[PDB]
Amino acid sequence: EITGLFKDLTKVKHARNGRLASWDQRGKNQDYWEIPAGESITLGEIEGPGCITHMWMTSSCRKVVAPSILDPELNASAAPVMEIHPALGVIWDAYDPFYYRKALIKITWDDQDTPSVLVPFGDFFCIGNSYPGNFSSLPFNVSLKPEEAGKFGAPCSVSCYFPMPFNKKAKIEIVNDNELPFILYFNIDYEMYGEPLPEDTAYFHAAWHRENPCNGWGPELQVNSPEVNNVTNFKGENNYTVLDVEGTGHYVGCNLTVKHFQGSWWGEGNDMFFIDGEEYPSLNGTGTEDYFNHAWGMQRNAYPFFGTIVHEGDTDGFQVSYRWHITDPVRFEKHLKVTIEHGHANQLSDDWSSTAYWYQILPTASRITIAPVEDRLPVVPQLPERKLVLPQLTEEQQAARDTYQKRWKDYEPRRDTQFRIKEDKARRESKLNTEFAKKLRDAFDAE
Amino acid sequence: EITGLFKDLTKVKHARNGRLASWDQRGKNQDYWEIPAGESITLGEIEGPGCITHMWMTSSCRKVVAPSILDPELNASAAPVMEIHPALGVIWDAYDPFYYRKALIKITWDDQDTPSVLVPFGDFFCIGNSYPGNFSSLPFNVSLKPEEAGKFGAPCSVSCYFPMPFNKKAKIEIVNDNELPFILYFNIDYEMYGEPLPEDTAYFHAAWHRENPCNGWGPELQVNSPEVNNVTNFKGENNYTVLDVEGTGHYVGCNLTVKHFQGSWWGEGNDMFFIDGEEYPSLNGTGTEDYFNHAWGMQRNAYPFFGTIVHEGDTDGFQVSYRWHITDPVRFEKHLKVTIEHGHANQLSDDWSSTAYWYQILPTASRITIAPVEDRLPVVPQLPERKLVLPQLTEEQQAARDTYQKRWKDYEPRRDTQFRIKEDKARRESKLNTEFAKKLRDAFDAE
Amino acid sequence: EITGLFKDLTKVKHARNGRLASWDQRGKNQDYWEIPAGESITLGEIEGPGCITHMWMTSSCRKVVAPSILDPELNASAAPVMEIHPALGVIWDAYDPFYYRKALIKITWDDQDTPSVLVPFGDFFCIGNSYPGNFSSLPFNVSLKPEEAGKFGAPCSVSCYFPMPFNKKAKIEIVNDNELPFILYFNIDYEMYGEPLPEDTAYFHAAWHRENPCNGWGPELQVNSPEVNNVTNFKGENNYTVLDVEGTGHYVGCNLTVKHFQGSWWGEGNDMFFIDGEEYPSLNGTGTEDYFNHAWGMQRNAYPFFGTIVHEGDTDGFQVSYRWHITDPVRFEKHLKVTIEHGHANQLSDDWSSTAYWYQILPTASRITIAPVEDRLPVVPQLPERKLVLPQLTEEQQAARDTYQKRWKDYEPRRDTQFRIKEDKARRESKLNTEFAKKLRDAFDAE
Amino acid sequence: EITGLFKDLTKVKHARNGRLASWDQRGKNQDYWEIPAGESITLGEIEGPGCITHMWMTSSCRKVVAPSILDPELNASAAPVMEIHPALGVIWDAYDPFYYRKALIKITWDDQDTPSVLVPFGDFFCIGNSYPGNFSSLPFNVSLKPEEAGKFGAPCSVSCYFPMPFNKKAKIEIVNDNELPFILYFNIDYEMYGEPLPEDTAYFHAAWHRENPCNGWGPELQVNSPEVNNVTNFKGENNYTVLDVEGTGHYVGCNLTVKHFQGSWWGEGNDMFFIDGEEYPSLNGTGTEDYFNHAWGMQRNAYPFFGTIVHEGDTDGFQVSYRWHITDPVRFEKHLKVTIEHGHANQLSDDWSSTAYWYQILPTASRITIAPVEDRLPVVPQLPERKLVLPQLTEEQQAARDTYQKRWKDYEPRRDTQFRIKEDKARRESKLNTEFAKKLRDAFDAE
Ligand SMILES: OC[C@H]1O[C@@H](O)[C@@H](O)[C@@H]1O
Ligand SMILES: OC[C@H]1O[C@@H](O)[C@@H](O)[C@@H]1O
Ligand SMILES: OC[C@H]1O[C@@H](O)[C@@H](O)[C@@H]1O
Ligand SMILES: OC[C@H]1O[C@@H](O)[C@@H](O)[C@@H]1O
Ligand SMILES: [Ca+2]
Ligand SMILES: [Ca+2]
Ligand SMILES: [Ca+2]
Ligand SMILES: [Ca+2]
Question: Which residues are recorded as binding Ca(2+) (chains A, B, C, D) (predicted)?
Fold first, then answer.
């Protein structure tokens, strides 16, 4: 009979599709949710048994910083994002650079008392450092326009093909720790099953970590100096920790964001895997790019199972990398610790953050935590404070300043009102999304 | 034991390879078929049980438009396509622009009364608008030389890796509705099985559709104006129809060719899927690029499961896109309607054409039809006619024109004869292909 | 329940991960082996039952050609490869151009009296002609820096995802026929199983071949001339042979390196497959790029199942191509001969070399042999020997020459000593890798 | 003493700078003129003796096609050009494609009864076919953003460094034959002399011509066919005419716009120059790209004295080329005819237009004339008429259409009012420019 990776297309399954989407439930063209500031919102709850098969999202986070001559009430029903150059003098909706780190995606399975996915919104979808890079891999993709590329908080399309099965419940939320609301478009595709999945089905988990700085013993020594290279590290007690989880499952890989400070090479450190509580690692690697299957540094390649999302050569000292263990998972019966030396023998004190992805049987024994929002922001240089003192103003210059400020006082509250109306639609459609998914489950189960 | 997408490589299967190919059955180097004008030709018939595993093709359609100083009889045995610049003045075989829409690929399973695949030759192989774009995806690939790219009817290699099981019969035909013959190279690889395929085996299906113009209510209104955006559309009675099919199976995606007329954006319309006769769509999308897993327009990306084949930014207003639902298929027990609003709430009157791909158990309940050839040609701007008046001619210029017309009246019928000869080879090898596949079937079944 | 190519991620397997790596077992930052000149070295032996799931390697081979002002003893403990421009006048470690062809990879399964893999180190990893090209495919990848690309012996990352099951034993070796040692970094991942694999399990095999020159009847005749194209070849006695193997299994593809001499096109020859001892080929192709799923020449494309690794357009007359038959394998019960005509009807006398990959049930019936190292080297044009005569020397010029000669006489032997020390580390780590793999085997089976 | 092309920087000149500019004479930031539709406007008149040394311009011509949610009265005081994507739904100011051909630049010297420069605005500044290309040469330059390039009527900066001496008067005018007004920014630099120039001083002249179609004897014969190539032409009576002028002076070159119809090569025709009424040309060229100092076609090169502005390989069949005879001028005592064969022996019937540049002693003997606006428009292919029909409209769709039509009824006249006010400023500043230029002249002469 039929073999190979396409074989399942040649047999029918009695499974019912459903979809959680930001679709405009007024039937109009606002097919996005305005996610409120400082709030969690449920994209949907799905009753199992079923499986998530595909996620697509895109997003925008703009801060109103100047009055516009665009009617704000009518503007609210036009295109949702005013991609208009500030030089035209007619509007200024600035880019919020770090909104991908200020928002989390949170997934809970089977009404467990802990989430199984708790990751910044960006990093989950392989946006490191809140700074998108255009790439394709087999389970994750980012479609980023070249004219939006190379800035913090650039808009782009994200897609996830990692399957997420659940016997009883799926609850998918966005946690917005931002002071600003943001626009989220999403299509979360699943299928519902007519019979339970095997009780030992492995469920999709993801967790985020940052060490900033890494606790390096030699940050001021040149990388690859004879003195650094002859230091020993076997047990890897101080290694950067990608994942430290208790249970039965397999790790399926990571993304890694590195901001490197000395301007040599951040990546001499070995991956070291500790399976099921062993004291010394059974799986020893050779270097950090080596783990990501590049060599002599990272290259501007993004391959199905590994590579570069954002290359250091294109940025102010930061790299985003990924490797998927899809046909080569790292398996564990009791425990897995995934580590990488942060520089050779933990020499360096760079800014490392990572998303770890794994599958495991429930219950989820490890309690997944997230650093608070103030520990999630990119490290960026800052212009020194310039204490501008106004020259002597003509009456004409003072009246321009006063007229503009009066426009700003009238305009900003009118935009605020339009934001509040859209946030109301989001909270309303959150409920509707869960209600329709319940109706779909019940109608499917009834036959 | 062995898991992951490569696992079937680790176990033998008692199945016998065969291949339908345009190989030169004289044993010489004309390993192509001259497909005759206005005729159908059978690439081959294969007795089941078996599965199509791979198709590769390439093609050329030239029109002789000028006399050549190349001996036409010897020229017939040189390379099959005279890629010689018209400025050399020695030959002119002009490119036929729309031959990809004028020819169909037609596949009938198990001696059914209706084809299960009836699609223009281009569109089946993800050439939209008879206008190749270079790209790769998991099931379909086009390899297009940059020097041939950017023109109607460019030569290129096409490859398909969608499996096509059949229990009783496969009949693969080209329907050439062109006034010209065209050169076809092909390799269709299949394997033969020793036992029947299960009765719930889903068979490969594809069908082509166009709405030109779409029935837009606001083609002259600016896209994303507040008036357009506050129109409602829940039921999608007037949505563009990608697929409307009765049976049990699953949709596995589409290509979509859009020629956009107003010069704004064509893509605001939501995908809406109607499963198993439901009145309101159960699967609600957010936008057309969103369905194709891009955002804020389409990008010049072609990923394994989605993207752009031909970008609007490179063309005279047209886009060719695809999405594959290989791990996330849209299943149906009785019926499936795959629709997309043509602009938000079907505002727009653009030229939309699509290839829908799906698998279903037999029988093919739905008679698959195709629009006639006059309805399949790309919409292109035309130069105004120029009623050129010859100047007063010198004797020398009159002699040149007469000598050239004489050369043309001798040369064209010599080229016509060489075409007719190659067409007799194609008709001969059609029969031989089916005879050999029968020998191979009988020898395999004897052992 | 769960379907599609990711499905195996949703079930746990009670299998234990292991890895053979070049990790520094002093715990320091020499995570590479200095592979000795004219020696074989075991990367590791693993006791089955198990499966290789992933290999990553990179390599460097430099010849010391000038004295350095870098302290040679300290330099041994710095970065392993001195990528320092010779115009600085401080060091010169020249690139060894053909080391990819002078070293072999050699894999023996279940203690058989033949290796099952015996292929030049480069060709195995889809580096043809000892001349890397940057590309991705589903099973094999090369990540080559653009700065390093376009030369013989360029450093690059290689990865292999073809699974390699074994019930009793895996033995992975490098055979270095080079007069120079070379640096090898490697990570070889596998999993160990608690029960045997089915005895009918198909084992990974690969073998290498070269015809230089091919035995052409008409190398001086223009390709695609009428005289060439009307020559017949049905039976393919003189076809280039990619593979000729007795057993039960399936061919999963090749790489092919062609150096072309006449400056026209090397690729008119058809693939012809002979299954189970048939006299005439049952699988006839149409041309060599056609086999590689390109058309009208090879393109600068590398797609998941086929394409170009190195494009003839970018070199001095040579191409490196691949095709993978992963979902479309060529199966055989008794025998398989994979051939391609070398030019149409074997017209041409070019330099062809290939790696064939297949799976088969044990035993390996025939010894896999390899051409000796003198027959494995790329064909490169040579500068005529420029018999330089020194002019009359000033005393200062003579003293400069003597001083330099003297530095070289002291420096070279100090670099030799440092190579011998690293070679001793490789031989020591060879034994430790096998001992650790046995400990892991025993501790796994103990549970 | 000092030599070379820089030498004149080492000697002072008792000459006064002046400048005609579109500077905002309200002292605000509208430093452009809205040139009224269907009017001429004087950029300025300058009393001699003096010399124009430098001209810079840019321009914009938008058509309001949709209602804006931008307040139009406030919008008039923001940036002058709403470079805002129509897909945002907030504004639509469409590009007018042919304004470069609908407006002329007209310069009259010494109050003569003819202009000495009468050339379409675009063509004068080496914008051919109302289609800018980015380039630099010694006397003319275009700086065109890549984002704006590849479209009719793209905004770009133009600069002219040809000197224009005048003993008595310079009058510089724009002649706007467009139905639409357009924005013009300009800076025209000159110096004023304290004594007359020698009376024999040669004055700058330019004239424009178009032959569409050219009067070809053989447009349907393949270019470079032996029949075409053996037709003779010594006297060039039917040659394309770049310049045909009576006086004493020198030709300093041309730009040439060709739209080529047969898709071979337009450029086999020789330049032939007839000096001082000779019957047979004394200067015989070899081909059209040869005249332009390219070969085997035109290249994407733009060099100080010659090259390509717009390359045929980037357009729908049209090329724009230039040559400057700055050190190699073509001198005449009584008469010059500059001709080029329109294809070999005037075979072809393509669309040729040119700007000829020359210097000559006054008087300008013959009126410089120009084809009327309807004879100046690029030849472009036209889409067939779409004859859309509205479907049956919902009450909602009808209400949206009525609301949008009402917004447009109100909005368009509001934009018309703002254009009329800016046109009043242009007419006002025309007078002020000439008044100020007279005050400068008188103040300088007083000194
Ligand atoms: O890729 C080989 C080695 O080169 C260096 O960049 C190290 O990080 C690595 O282990
Ligand atoms: O990608 C987000 C949204 O942007 C617009 O171009 C819409 O087509 C889409 O719904
Ligand atoms: O790809 C079509 C044909 O063109 C030539 O390059 C041949 O090698 C091939 O069979
Ligand atoms: O450049 C040499 C010759 O090549 C052809 O394109 C002719 O137009 C020209 O005279
Ligand atoms: Ca290391
Ligand atoms: Ca929408
Ligand atoms: Ca052939
Ligand atoms: Ca000529």
Answer: 29, 31, 268, 270, 286
Distance CA C163, CA C160 (A): 9
Q: CB-based contact (8 Å) between D28 and chain A?
A: no
Q: How far is B238 from chain A (nearest CA, A)?
A: 14
Around Cβ A112, how many Cβ atoms within 10 Å? 15
| Eight-class DSSP state of B369 | -
Structure tokens of D219?
A: 């447009």
**A293/chain C closest Cα distance in angstroms:** 6
Task: Name the β-bridge partners of A310.
Answer: A320
On whether the CB atoms of residues D209 and D242 are closer than 8 A, the answer is yes
Please list every protein residue whose CB sits less than 6 Å from any atom of ligand 1.
A 265, 267-268, 286-287, 289-290, 295-297; C 31, 58, 185
Q: Does the C-beta of A56 come closer than 6 Å to ligand 2? A: no
What whole-number distance in Å separates Cα of residue A127 and Cα of residue A133? 7
| Identity at C102, one-letter amino acid code | K
The C-alpha atoms of residue A266 and residue C223 are separated, in whole angstroms, by 53
Maximum Cα–Cα distance across chain B: 88
Question: Residues 358-417, chain D: which have Cβ within 8 Å of B?
Answer: 379-384, 386, 388, 390-391, 393-394, 396-397, 400-401, 403-404, 407
Whether omega before C155 lies within 30 degrees of 0, making that bond cis, reads no
Plot region of A331 (φ>0 → left; ψ -120 to 50 → alpha; else → beta): beta
D367/B60 Cα distance (integer angstroms): 56
C150 in contact with chain B, both atoms CB, cutoff 8 A: no
Q: How far apart are CA C12 and CA B447, in angstroms?
A: 40
- The 8 Å CB, 24+ separation contacts for D65-68 are D65/D92, D65/D93, D65/D94, D66/B222, D66/B225, D66/D91, D66/D92, D66/D408, D67/B222, D67/B225, D67/D404, D67/D407, D67/D408, D67/D410, D67/D411, D67/D412, D68/D92, D68/D411, D68/D415
CA distance A433 to B232: 19
The alpha carbon torsion through B340, B341, B343, B349 (nearest 10 deg) reads: 100
- All residues of chain C having their beta carbon less than 8 Å from the beta carbon of residue B4 are 8, 53, 163
Whole-number Å distance, alpha carbon B355 to ligand 2 midpoint, is 23
Check whether B286 is labelled as a binding-site residue.
Answer: yes
Token pair recorded at residue A365: 């024994």
**Token digits for B145?**
């030389």
Element (H, E) at C77: none
> What are the residue ranges of helices labelled H in D128-251?
226-229
Identify the bridge partners of residue B16 per DSSP, sorted by sequence position.
Answer: B192
C296 touches chain B (CB under 8 A): yes
Is A231 near chain D, with CB under 8 Å? Answer: no
Backbone angles phi, psi at C97, to 5 degrees: -75, -30
Q: D166 near D203, Cβ under 8 Å? A: yes
Give, for A283, the enclosing helix (H) or strand (E): strand A283-284
Residue B293 CB–ligand 2 contact under 6 Å = no
Q: Which amino acid is at B224?
A: N
- Give the C-alpha separation, C299 to B158, whole Å: 13
3-class secondary-structure state, position C81: coil
Alpha-carbon distance C365 to C179, whole Å?
Answer: 33
| Burial call B400-431: b when 16+ CB within 10 Å, e when fewer | bbebbeebbeebeebbeebeeebbebbeebbe
Is residue D212 a contact partner of residue D379, using CB atoms and an 8 Å limit?
yes
Residue bearing tokens 């330059």: D141
**Atom 10 (ligand 1) nearest CA:** A287
Query: Helix and strand tally (H, E) in chain A?
Result: 6, 24
Q: How was this structure determined?
A: X-ray
Name the burial class of residue A96, with classes exposed (0-12), middle (13-18) and buried (19+) by CB atoms within 10 angstroms of its CB: buried
